Amino acid sequence: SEEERQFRKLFVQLAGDDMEVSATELMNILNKVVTRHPDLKTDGFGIDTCRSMVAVMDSDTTGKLGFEEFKYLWNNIKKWQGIYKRFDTDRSGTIGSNELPGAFEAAGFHLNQHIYSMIIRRYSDETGNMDFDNFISCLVRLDAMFRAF
Template identity: 40%
Template sequence: MAYPGYGGGFGNFSGQMPGMQPMPGAGPNVFLGGYPGPLPYSDSYSSAGDPMWSYFTAVAGQDGEVDAEELQRCLTESGISGTYSPFSLETCRIMIAMLDRDYTGKMGFNEFKELWAALTAWKENFMTIDRDRSGTVEHHELSQSIAIMGYRLSPQTLNTIVRRYSKNGRIFFDDYVACCVKLRALTDFFRRRDHLQQGFVNFVYDDFLQGTMAI
């Protein structure tokens, strides 16, 4: 039986910036059923000497967290998008929602580091399949990328994803990241309720709405 995953190789990316040491606990944490677990981050992590800390604190509020607009500025200044267009505000909102475990609508530094690791992995994946360096990928390339990340989706589901995230049959980097965020967040939401890791769960309507509307 095949189980959905959000990338068996996700934890193999270090998500590093130049001069940055490997993040603690960045190795894969795989559960039964093929679900990779979330990357562990400790609240006691020290930010001293971390190149990412300056990007984060430059835009973080007095509460030490960033909202969607601040995250957008932070990611733009960090250069994670490279030659691609800066992330849209909507993409930044769903990035926060993916890791917003306390439902504040904001992101702390440890969550930001976890997001950076994901973005780095997704960008490397995108660049691998964008061989002509057009800044976009097509349907068959997106299918290849999703398979590389460890998802096993039906052709019907893949067609739905392409229709949702493509513009004239091509998927730009911003939309690609939005797609990856949704896939990871929805899979994680499903996995947390699949206690036996069997690939199926029962939802009540309100629980389903809370999980899907949050992202």
């Protein structure tokens, strides 16, 4: 419906002067998500993770995220946020070892030993839980990888 009309207003407002979303503007919008959802355990989205997101999502290499690049990422993020909440069945405000398999499958990813050992590990705490920002960050990198073998 007009939710597409809603998204265009979001993009234009967020992108500003240059019409593209930089890592800073991305950081702004992601921390707005954490602001509106205090039920999410998170230490916020740092500039480093947001620069990494842009680097792997900026496929036309403009250095920032254009309309189509931001729309793709944004819908993914909103979709993953829904998954994050849906799969946190122990109400920990995080996604743990018993929740992750289902969550990643719902996000459209198939896991393997490499992924668990080389990716998931670095994004989770000592009990295997990943907070909201790590969860989203891990998925952006995983999506960037899947879309590009």
